[PDB]
């Protein structure tokens, strides 16, 4: 359950290795896995909670002025001074105007002049950071096989919550019966914190990488605060008028809050109310399944006479869940579920309940499977054959491989070479892939980082052009690589 309908999902066939598997899962996604045995399990990822933050920065989006004395000496000797220029809690500026007999005093010249203002800010940004510690993931790992009510409703208790923290490991999990399961995270391979900043505005928050959050303009102030009111900056805030000649003036700059939104676009937000809500991100766990029963063994095959309720329920491509309600005696006996061709048994489906089972009797047990690209004849019935349902799966085969390639492409993007890890145990080829793309894309994808939709696509077409006119066969190392990485990564990103 709990996967169905989320689309975007991750079928992982087989394990081998004697044990393990490599799963890369995030948030909006989820994962369904299988082996030649052991029950099909689903890994769905929910809230990530980093507990202890620590507060680095105070940005204020709004302030006000008052008091605000000013002075001028007269228009040579001296550059004017004012005592409140002392306390940096004021803001100060020198300017030059003029004076004379009209001003009354000396000398007829262009004078120096100064001003200062008291500075106070009501609104802030709380931005904090979290060390790659005190942070944890929570997972629901849900069994298939019946037990009514939803392929869905992630609420409700089946796959526990299996929490995990880098401070611990090995992720020992248990479910009813077979439910012994071993997972191992690699959170230190996760979002790469210490590059990260969590930023709380009035409520809404945003996760943005550190440097930019350092370099960002607007009034500075360090995490210590403590009455300090010590704000650096303010030059970019609070602009000063100087109309044509006389005097000068100071102006509260006005709230930038929205403009700050316009800035924080291009960043995943985060809700933070109590301590953390953190969503998104991704993680990599490795799965050792040894330790798993098939959930029932040595039974009798049903008896006969199933009655269906509901119908077909094709989602994505494949899984085709069906709901059925057994009628009879035989008690939790296996359900003879089969998927077959026309007549003349060639029989091929593939079934994911694996080993569906009747429960206590009355309860709407359900199933999911993968018919071929074409016509499908599905049969649950045995002794009087009791049932057959006609089905047709449109689409085909080639299109399937194609779309699959699209998914693997997106996964090469978004997630990087952890993507290469997302399969399992390709021996050499997989590893050498992860490394080649590792340092390779490490150099190339980044460095020509920090660029947006426009400049990306455009630089793409130009460099692929210069490739098209290149000589010495190096065009390919231009060109095919070029256009691919550039274009394909062009439209997919920036979401």
């Amino acid at each position, epitope marked *: 359950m709990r996967c169905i309908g989320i689309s975007n999902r991750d079928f992982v066939e087989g394990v081998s290795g004697g044990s393990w598997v490599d799963i890369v899962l995030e948030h909006g996604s989820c994962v369904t896995t299988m082996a030649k045995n052991k029950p099909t399990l689903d890994f769905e990822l929910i809230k990530t909670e980093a*507990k*202890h933050p620590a507060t680095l920065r105070k940005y204020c989006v709004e302030a006000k002025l008052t008091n605000t004395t000013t002075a001028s000496r007269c228009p040579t000797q001296g550059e004017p001074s004012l005592n409140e220029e002392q306390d940096k809690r004021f803001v100060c500026k020198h300017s030059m105007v003029d004076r004379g007999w009209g001003n009354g005093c000396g000398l007829f010249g262009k004078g120096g002049i100064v001003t200062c203002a008291m500075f106070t800010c009501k609104k802030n940004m709380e931005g904090k950071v979290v060390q790659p510690e005190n942070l944890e993931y929570t997972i629901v790992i849900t069994p298939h096989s019946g037990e009514e009510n939803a392929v869905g409703n992630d609420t409700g208790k089946h796959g526990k919550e299996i929490k995990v923290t880098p401070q611990s490991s090995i992720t020992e999990a248990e479910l009813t019966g077979y439910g012994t399961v071993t997972m191992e995270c690699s959170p230190r391979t996760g979002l790469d914190f210490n590059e990260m900043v969590l930023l709380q505005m009035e409520n809404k928050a945003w996760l943005v990488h550190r440097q930019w959050f350092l370099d960002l303009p607007l009034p500075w102030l360090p995490g*210590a*605060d*403590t*009455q300090g*009111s010590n704000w650096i900056q303010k030059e970019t805030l609070v602009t000063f008028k100087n109309p044509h000649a006389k005097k000068q003036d100071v102006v509260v700059l006005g709230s930038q809050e929205g403009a700050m939104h316009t800035a924080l676009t291009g960043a995943t937000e985060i809700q933070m109310s*109590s*301590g953390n809500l953190l969503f998104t991100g991704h993680l990599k766990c490795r799965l050792r399944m040894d330790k798993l029963q098939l959930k029932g063994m040595s039974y009798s095959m049903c008896t006969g006479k199933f009655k269906v309720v509901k119908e077909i329920a094709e989602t994505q491509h494949g899984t085709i869940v069906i709901r059925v309600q057994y009628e009879g005696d035989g008690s939790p006996c296996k359900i003879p579920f089969e998927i077959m061709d026309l007549e003349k048994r060639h029989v091929l489906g593939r079934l994911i309940t694996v080993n569906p089972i009747v429960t206590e009797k009355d309860s709407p047990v359900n199933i999911e499977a993968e018919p071929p690209f074409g016509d499908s004849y599905i049969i649950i019935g045995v002794e009087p054959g009791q049932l057959k349902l006609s089905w047709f799966k449109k689409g085909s085969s080639i299109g399937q491989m194609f779309e699959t390639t699209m998914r693997g492409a997106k996964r090469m993007a978004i997630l990087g070479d952890t993507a290469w890890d997302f399969g399992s145990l390709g021996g050499v080829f997989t590893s050498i892939g992860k490394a080649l793309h590792q340092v390779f894309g490490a150099i190339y994808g980044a460095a020509f980082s920090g660029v947006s939709w426009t400049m990306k696509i455009l630089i793409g077409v130009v460099i692929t052009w210069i490739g098209m006119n290149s000589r010495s066969t190096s065009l390919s190392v231009s060109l095919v690589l070029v256009g691919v990485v550039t274009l394909y990564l062009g439209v997919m990103v920036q979401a």
Partner: antibody, heavy 132, light 107 residues
């Protein structure tokens, strides 16, 4: 011995500022953190802030943001708390005490932590009343 | 933030009785918690650190317990001189905070 002598009780007018002193003895005055905790009569304990004797680093709670300065005299092995813009709510008894910790400068949570912050080696308190 | 709840607010008990307090934390505070005794007109005093630990010089009838968010202070045998108000203290994160206190009344 481990000891604290705060200055005697005082009364001030609203909007004013008051300066309470905390003197210590029985250890190396730079070897322990200082914190100020207030108790209003009809209330329990409230944590005002912190100063480090060594080096002068300081911090304060959000409620007293803007209102409280902390300083020290190492020569006298003494700390000074000061509150500004006194208001009737401020009327309470104040307390000061220490911490064993690591230093240079004053926060910590991961290092050591705890150890009778202000229950065994706490000053005698002092009463301050904001009144007209 | 680190809201510390203290229960109950007060208790009356006969001498020799066993008494227990409970403090509940809005966040997991792990082993950082404290137990004060304070007699009226006196500075507060130490009893329990790390929620588990007596101080030297403290009578043995005192004990403390609990781990993640929840904790219990205990006096095995109520003794008259123990009349005071008691507290629990969250040190974690350093927005330093106390429990509201629990008063005793001897029977």
């Amino acid at each position: 011995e481990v000891q604290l002598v705060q200055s005697g009780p005082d009364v001030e007018k609203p909007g004013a500022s008051v300066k309470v002193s905390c003197k210590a003895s029985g250890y190396t005055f730079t070897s322990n953190y200082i914190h100020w905790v207030r108790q209003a009569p009809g209330q329990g304990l409230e944590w005002m802030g912190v100063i480090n004797p060594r080096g002068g680093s300081t911090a304060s709670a959000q409620k007293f943001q803007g209102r409280i300065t902390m300083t020290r005299d190492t020569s006298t092995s003494t700390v000074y708390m000061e509150l500004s813009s006194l208001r009737s709510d401020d009327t309470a008894v104040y307390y000061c005490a220490r911490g064993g910790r690591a230093l240079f400068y004053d926060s910590y949570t991961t290092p050591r932590d705890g150890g009778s912050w202000w229950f065994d080696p706490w000053g005698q308190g002092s009463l301050v009343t904001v009144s007209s | 933030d680190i809201q510390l709840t203290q229960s109950p607010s007060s208790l009356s008990a006969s001498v020799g009785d066993r008494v227990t307090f409970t403090c509940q934390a809005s966040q997991d505070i792990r082993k950082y918690l404290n137990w004060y005794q304070q007699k009226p007109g006196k500075a507060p005093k130490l009893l329990i650190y790390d929620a588990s630990n007596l101080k030297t010089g403290v009578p043995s009838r005192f004990s403390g317990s609990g781990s993640g968010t929840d904790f219990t202070f205990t006096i095995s045998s109520l003794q008259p001189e123990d009349v005071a108000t008691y507290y629990c203290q969250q040190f974690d994160d350093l927005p330093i905070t106390f429990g509201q206190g629990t008063r005793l009344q001897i029977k």
